[PDB]
């Protein structure tokens, strides 16, 4: 029936698709038996080729759907104006599954589970595209929009989607790309320092698109830099140029709604005022506020199990998840003290930013420990004091 599995590779290894495919199939057959992350390989051919094999969201006997990528170490690249005296235009670039973003998919957590939504979005996209929907009969326009409080892992989430679909589309793409021009001329807004540059960017996009053996993620954070609100005030000190900015963006999006392999992901800080078109030129809207207690506790679990995994938490302990702690009947016992304290930590950790959230432990160990010789049961209380100080600096900005 329905089973789909991923394959992570070592850089210097250079075996072909089919060979590693057969190898991982043989491992799946040898096991034939929740998720699991194959990283320790009896088979030395695997260790020579494969790093990890994961179960991405017990039965095994199903249609083996394997996908073998290779993380690339090239992080930056050139994308700016090239005529003369032009470097700082700063259109950040990436190649597809290149290393930087490994595991970053399952990194984030959102109880709304926009993940699955966003995923089978593009899945069903290609589905229709295969069935050759007569476009103008039933039409959809390649935009996906999110927004919320700043720093909420938004750009992160975009890139995660990119990587994950990537692994889902080596079958259909040799590679792909990622664009991010955001914040460079997204805070200047001068004469065509917006417009002309948008034309240039979508020129570059247009060209870099038509590789049908390549997928395209156009990522535009800071969309609130690309809205004019249609002059909510009759003070057009800088309303005129902004109008044209908006029109450029809309027009480019449209003109490129005719490329089989183009997905655009966009995010914004301000809740409102951000457009009248985009909001209505929006295949899918989304507001992603502060994470609930669930995601907070999950992020806690994650970082804690990592620092265990890093031996930085030296005594490797074990915790209990949300419904796991629900199962113990909230019995305050030996195992449960740390986990229930962590629950109350999340509780008194309400309304924060994933930025600050997965910032916490550094400044915690900083202001409280400054020692690799440290364990849990003190790390929690020190962390809590750190978080209180974090509240106090969030109020220190008034």
Mark 106-125 with x for binding to a second copy (rule: CB under 8 A) and - for no binding: -x---------x-xxx-xx-
Interhelix angle 195-209/240-255, nearest 10 degrees: 10
Please tell me whether residue 225 binds ligand AGS under the rule CB under 6 A.
Answer: no
200 with 162: CB under 8 angstroms?
A: no
What contacts 211, CB < 8 A, 6 or more positions away? 174, 261
Nearer to ligand AGS, 135 or 318 (CB): 135
Say how many residues make up the chain. Answer: 398
DSSP state string for 61-128: -S-----B-----------S--SSS--TT--EEEESS-GGGTTHHHH---TT-HHHHHHHHHHHHHHH
Q: Where the chain is broken, by preceding residue (C–N > 2.5 Å)?
A: 33, 57
Scanning 6-14, 25-33, 198-206, 352-360 for contacts with ligand AGS by CB under 6 A, the matching segment is 352-360
Please tell me whether residue 151 binds ligand AGS under the rule CB under 6 A.
Answer: yes
User: Binders of ligand AGS among 89-108, rule CB under 6 A?
Assistant: 107-108
Integer Cα distance of 217 and 177 in angstroms? 6
Please give the distance of CA 211 from its chain centroid, rounded to a whole number: 24
Six-digit token pair at 242? 């902004």
Q: Is 148 annotated as a binding residue?
A: yes
User: Cα dihedral sign for 376, 378, 382, 387?
Assistant: positive
Nearer to a second copy, 137 or 233 (CB): 137
Give the Cβ contact number of residue 24 at 10 Å: 23
Question: Which option in a second copy, ligand AGS, none does residue 250 bind, with CB closer than 5 to 8 A by kind?
Answer: a second copy
- Residue from 199, 203, 311, 321 touching a second copy (CB under 8 A): that is 311
Question: Which option in a second copy, ligand AGS, none does residue 366 bind, with CB closer than 5 to 8 A by kind?
Answer: a second copy
Nearer to a second copy, 25 or 285 (CB): 285
User: Binders of ligand AGS among 275-294, rule CB under 6 A?
Assistant: 291
Scanning 42-50, 133-141, 189-197, 260-268 for contacts with a second copy by CB under 8 A, the matching segment is 133-141
Question: Which option in ligand AGS, a second copy, none does residue 140 bind, with CB closer than 5 to 8 A by kind?
Answer: a second copy
Please tell me whether residue 346 binds ligand AGS under the rule CB under 6 A.
Answer: no
**How far from each other are the two terminal CA atoms of the chain, in whole angstroms?**
56
What contacts 347, CB < 8 A, 6 or more positions away? 293
- Shortest spacing between CB 372 and a second copy, in angstroms: 5
Integer Cα distance of 320 and 309 in angstroms? 16
Nearer to ligand AGS, 241 or 283 (CB): 283
Six-digit token pair at 374? 């440290």
Please tell me whether residue 95 binds a second copy under the rule CB under 8 A.
Answer: no
Binding site for ligand AGS (CB under 6 A): 107-110, 137, 150-156, 221, 291, 295, 299, 354-355, 358
What is the contact surface with a second copy in residues (CB under 8 A)? 73, 75-76, 78, 87-88, 90, 92, 101-104, 107, 117, 119-121, 123-124, 127-128, 130-134, 136-140, 183-184, 227, 243, 246-247, 250-251, 254-255, 275-277, 280, 283-284, 302-303, 306-307, 309-312, 355, 358-359, 361-363, 365-367, 370, 372
List residues forming the annotated binding site. Answer: 148-155
Q: What are the binding residues for ATP?
A: 148-155
């Amino acid at each position: 029936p329905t089973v789909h599995v991923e394959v992570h590779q070592r850089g210097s290894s250079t075996a072909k698709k089919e060979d590693i495919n057969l190898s991982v199939r043989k491992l799946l057959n040898r096991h034939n038996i929740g998720d699991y992350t194959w990283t320790e390989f009896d088979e030395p051919f695997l260790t020579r080729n494969v790093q990890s094999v994961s179960i991405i969201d017990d039965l095994s006997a199903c249609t083996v759907a394997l996908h073998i990528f290779q993380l690339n170490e090239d992080g930056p690249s050139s994308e700016n104006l090239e005529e003369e005296t032009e470097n700082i235009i700063a259109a950040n670039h990436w190649v597809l599954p290149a290393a930087e973003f490994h595991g970053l998919w399952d990194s984030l957590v959102y109880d709304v589970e926009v993940k699955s939504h966003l995923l089978d979005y593009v899945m069903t996209t290609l589905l229709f595209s295969d069935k050759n929907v007569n476009s103008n009969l039933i039409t959809w326009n390649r935009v996906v929009l999110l927004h919320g409080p700043p720093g909420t892992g938004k750009t992160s989430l975009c890139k995660a989607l990119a990587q994950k679909l990537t692994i889902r589309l080596s079958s259909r793409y040799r590679y792909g790309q990622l664009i991010e021009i955001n914040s460079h001329s997204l805070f200047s807004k001068w004469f065509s320092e917006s417009g002309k540059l948008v034309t240039k960017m979508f020129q570059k996009i247009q060209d870099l698109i038509d590789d049908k053996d390549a997928l395209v993620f156009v990522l535009i954070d800071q969309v609130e830099s690309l809205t004019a609100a249609r002059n909510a005030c009759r003070a057009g000190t800088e309303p005129s140029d902004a109008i044209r900015v908006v029109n450029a963006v809309l027009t480019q999006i449209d003109q490129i709604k005719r490329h089989s392999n183009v997905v655009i992901l966009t995010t914004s800080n301000i809740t409102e005022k951000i457009d009248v078109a985009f909001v209505d030129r929006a295949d899918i809207k989304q507001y992603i506020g502060p994470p609930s207690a669930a995601a907070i506790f999950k992020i806690y679990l994650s970082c804690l199990e990592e620092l265990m995994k890093c031996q930085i938490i030296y005594p490797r302990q074990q915790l209990l998840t949300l419904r796991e702690l629900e199962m113990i009947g909230f019995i305050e016992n030996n195992v449960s003290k740390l986990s229930l304290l962590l629950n109350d930590i999340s509780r008194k950790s309400e309304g924060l930013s994933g930025r600050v959230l997965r910032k916490l432990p550094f400044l915690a160990h900083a202001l409280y420990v400054q020692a690799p010789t440290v364990t849990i049961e003190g790390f929690l209380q020190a962390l809590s004091l750190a978080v209180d100080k974090q509240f106090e600096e969030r109020k220190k900005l008034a």
